[PDB]
């Protein structure tokens, strides 16, 4: 509109009204030119193509995208505490994304000294894919998202994708995409960009922990009318076989009939925190649970939602069972245990089997006079009629939504890293700098503001529980810093992952 | 005709495990290193960023469809075993004491990329013309392969980490699959059996499931 007229204001806050929460987040961004305005093929052959499991083929693009998939983008540590303590459920309703205050800086480097001046006639192309025609990279829990802390300025990640491959080669079915082939919106220093998105109806995330267990649903005061075989033999000796039945009752609760059974399981290897209790060998990949696709083994990470450990155990965790977050300052390769944050999914232990335990036992033969009864362990159990299970929990750090893949059929589309499965998720937002003059261009970058607004719908806590619930609290003791704040150097760190499950319900 | 879902007649230009952005790291870490090095008592826990370099350890939101393994048969006879295994080695399901061959069974990839000759024993329709479900490999496991691995024990100082193969795997939450491709010589519709319950009523020989067909 004008060179000296701002194209938008700063909106950050979280107003809570009724059963809905509106969160507004504004940041500052910088978008460099990627690949010198070139689309370039990429494959592991550039990196040497060491492994077959690591093989990939795809393309890098000059475009950049805006990502707000992680939960901490939209929630402060206070807003997240206000959410998880007071509610049994939540889910996104509406989305509003504004892009404004465009500034194009030209870098002038003359004889080793560099001066940065404005380019007022430059444009910045932006578009969204609302037909879901491009590959969707927002569901892989990638880096480059909006910062948790409102005063941080973030760099936009570079958009690239992958397609079919054999080794590092392509195949006749592989696809190539030119994002220039979409209609886009051009922005000079006074222009702005916005769009609104409507989430499709999803089930409320269950931010609660059961106060009962699946094997303890029965009234403990009354005997069942069902019967179970108690004794197969009268006494030790020859020809002592007999059939004797007993009432299923509170004295023996393991044999009582039940209408429902715990959810599916795919076992993980359990790693002990005390290093001397672990096996003295390298088993991170060898002893890992994995699945195969097109002749390539992929690790089962995180996989099906299962309890991390049995109650009363604090020193064991599944090898690939839970999401692991790095603390700030943590290095890219082989960092120590203190640097990382391994999440715990012990809340779901009541309805789900433990990740590191067998589902149960089955008979593998017919008992007879000649042969004794034999059972064997179920390492993995698929869906059975009568099963119930809890989805994996969502974290302040972790991802929000995923795109349900497009297939003939799926079961329980909820994503395995947590969050809301959607066949039409929030659309990708693609942005780039317009090349300004052919391989010779002008050194150029752009910057501005990004505001995002999501309306959340809440499910209130109706519980009749008499005693007080567990709540997420800030511990009170003296320390050199307060948690979830900046230190003396200006670095804002998040000390721990905050789960969503504190309040309880009946099973 | 009652309402049926549109039959998919397209092949994915991506694979389930490559959905990632190749240029960017994940914020998730994995356990890279359990031992500092060779020698006695060299035990440690070290974590690395999951990213473009190592793509098989990254976190994933979805996993491939179910599998019930078919025995593999090579079109070159000399590579096959010199024995009669058509029935003795068949994948089958038992009903009321009678063993029925699992023909065709769950939709899976007929063969891995680069192995045109091999095909599942009973896994394909045969009109002889043996059809192969090459397209479904992106979201489906291969017919002749194990679904994956699971741990069979608790590793400790005394015992090494032990795995075991998954030959059949039922539905899990988070799975996706492609049905069997319909053919010009193949069937159109089938009658869904009248039962208390069923899952994914689509018929296994291909085509549309209907409770009230023609």
């Amino acid at each position, epitope marked *: 509109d004008g060179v000296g007229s701002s194209s938008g204001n700063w909106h950050c806050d979280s107003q809570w009204l009724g059963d809905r929460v509106i969160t507004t987040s504004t940041r500052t961004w910088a978008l460099p030119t990627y690949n010198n305005h070139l689309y370039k093929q990429i494959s592991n052959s550039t990196s040497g193509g060491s492994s077959n499991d690591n093989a990939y083929f795809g393309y890098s693009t000059p475009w950049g995208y805006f990502d707000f998939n992680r939960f901490h983008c939209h929630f402060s540590p206070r807003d997240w505490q206000r959410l998880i303590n007071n509610n049994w459920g939540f889910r996104p309703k509406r989305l509003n994304f504004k892009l404004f205050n465009i500034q194009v800086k030209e870098v002038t480097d003359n004889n080793g000294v560099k001066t940065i001046a404005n380019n007022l006639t430059s444009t910045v192309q932006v578009f969204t894919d609302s037909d879901y025609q491009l590959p969707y990279v927002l569901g892989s829990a990638h880096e480059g998202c909006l910062p948790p802390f409102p005063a941080d300025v973030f760099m936009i990640p570079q958009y690239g994708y992958l397609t079919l491959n054999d080794g590092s080669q392509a195949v006749g079915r592989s696809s190539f995409y030119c994002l220039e082939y979409f209609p886009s919106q051009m922005l000079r220093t006074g222009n702005n960009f916005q769009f609104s998105y409507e989430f499709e109806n999803v089930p409320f995330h269950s931010s609660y922990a059961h106060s009962q267990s699946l094997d303890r649903l029965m009234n403990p005061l009354i005997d069942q009318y069902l019967y179970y075989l108690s004794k197969t033999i009268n006494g030790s000796g020859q020809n002592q076989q007999t059939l004797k039945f007993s009432v299923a009752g509170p004295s023996n609760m393991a044999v009582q009939g039940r209408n429902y059974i715990p959810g599916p399981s795919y076992r993980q290897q359990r790693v002990s925190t*005390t290093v001397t209790q672990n096996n003295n060998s390298e088993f991170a990949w060898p002893g890992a649970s994995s699945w195969a696709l097109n002749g390539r083994n992929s690790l089962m990470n995180p996989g099906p939602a299962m309890a991390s450990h049995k109650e009363g155990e604090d020193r064991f965790f599944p090898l690939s069972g839970s999401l692991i977050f790095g603390k700030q300052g943590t290095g890219r390769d082989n960092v120590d245990a203190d640097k990382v944050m391994i999440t715990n999914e012990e809340e779901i232990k009541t309805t789900n089997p433990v990740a590191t335990e067998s589902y149960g036992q089955v008979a593998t033969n017919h008992q007879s006079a000649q042969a004794q009864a034999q059972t064997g362990w179920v390492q993995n159990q698929g869906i059975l009629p009568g099963m119930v299970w809890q989805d994996r929990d969502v974290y302040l750090q972790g991802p929000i939504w995923a795109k349900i893949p497009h297939t003939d059929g799926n079961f329980h589309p909820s994503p395995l890293m947590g969050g809301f499965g959607m066949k039409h998720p929030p659309p990708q937002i693609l942005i780039k700098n317009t090349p300004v003059p052919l391989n010779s261009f002008i050194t150029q970058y752009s910057t501005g503001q990004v505001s995002v607004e999501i309306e959340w719908e809440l499910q209130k806590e109706n519980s009749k529980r008499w005693n007080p619930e567990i709540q997420y609290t800030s*511990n009170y003791y003296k320390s050199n810093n307060v948690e979830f704040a900046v230190n003396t150097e200006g670095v804002y760190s998040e000390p721990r992952p905050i789960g969503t499950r504190y309040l309880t319900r009946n099973l | 005709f009652e309402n049926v879902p549109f039959h998919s007649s397209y092949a994915h230009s991506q694979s389930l495990d490559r959905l990632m952005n190749p240029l960017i790291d994940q914020y998730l870490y994995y356990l890279s290193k359990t031992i*500092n090095g060779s020698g006695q008592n060299q035990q440690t826990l070290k974590f690395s960023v999951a990213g473009p370099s190592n793509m098989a350890v990254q976190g994933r939101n979805y996993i491939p469809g179910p599998s019930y393994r078919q025995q593999r048969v090579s079109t070159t006879v000399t590579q096959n075993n010199n024995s009669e295994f058509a029935w003795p080695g068949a994948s089958s399901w038992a009903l009321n004491g009678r063993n029925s061959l699992m023909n065709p069974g769950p939709a899976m990839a007929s063969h891995k990329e680069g192995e045109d000759r091999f095909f599942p024993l009973s896994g394909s329709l045969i009109f002889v013309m043996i059809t192969n479900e090459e397209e479904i490999k992106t979201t489906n496991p291969v017919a002749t392969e194990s679904y994956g691995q699971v741990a069979t024990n608790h590793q400790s100082a005394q015992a090494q980490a032990q795995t075991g193969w998954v030959q059949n795997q039922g539905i899990l939450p988070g799975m996706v699959w492609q049905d069997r491709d319909v053919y010009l010589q193949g069937p159109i519709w089938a009658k869904i059996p009248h039962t208390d319950g069923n899952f994914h009523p689509s018929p296994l020989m291909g085509g549309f499931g209907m409770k009230h067909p023609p």
Partner: antibody
Amino acid sequence: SEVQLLESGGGLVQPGKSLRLSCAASGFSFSNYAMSWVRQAPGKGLEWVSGISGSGGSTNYAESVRGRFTISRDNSKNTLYLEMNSLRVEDTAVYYCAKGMSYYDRSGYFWAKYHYGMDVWGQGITVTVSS
Amino acid sequence: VLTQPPSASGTPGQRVTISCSGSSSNIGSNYVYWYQQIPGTAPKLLIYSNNQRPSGVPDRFSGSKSGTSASLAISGLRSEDEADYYCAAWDDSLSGNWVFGGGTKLTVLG
């Protein structure tokens, strides 16, 4: 000095006999730190005997005291308990109750490396094993 | 175990260094803690997490770790700084133990 640890149950015990030590903790959240017992023999350096996790699920012991001693804690009563069996003259020492400085919870896991560091100690109770 | 010199000596206002030698399992891969104890009293924490120090501890006490050895340096030594020093670190080997050094008795001469 907000944090306070007390020890009771110290005394003179003949060899072979077993006695129980208790520590009363106050001024901090007890179940969120892993406690430990450290013993100092007269005219000798400090020696760590055993430590327990905040939940109480995992416990560690020094080789010398292993199998004779057992460490337990009652989180409801904020008490660290050390039960010693088959005592011997070698056990005469001043036993201390040391609180684990690092704070952790159910969201994370117990890490013996990080959580055994002890910021505050206790006065200690002398224990004598003589005939 | 962690090895420490039995005694160390200093003059007031002069820097003194106390060091503990350790194996790969303890000093090499784990944080080292320093405890100051005066006889007839429960120990006090001086340095934790290699170079960090708790509040209420004077600036002069500095601790560092290189390789398998950790050194505690005292500057502006005082009469009240004379006590026994214990070096501690977690030991991965032999089932996991917290190990204290043998102790060092710092004497302020003069």
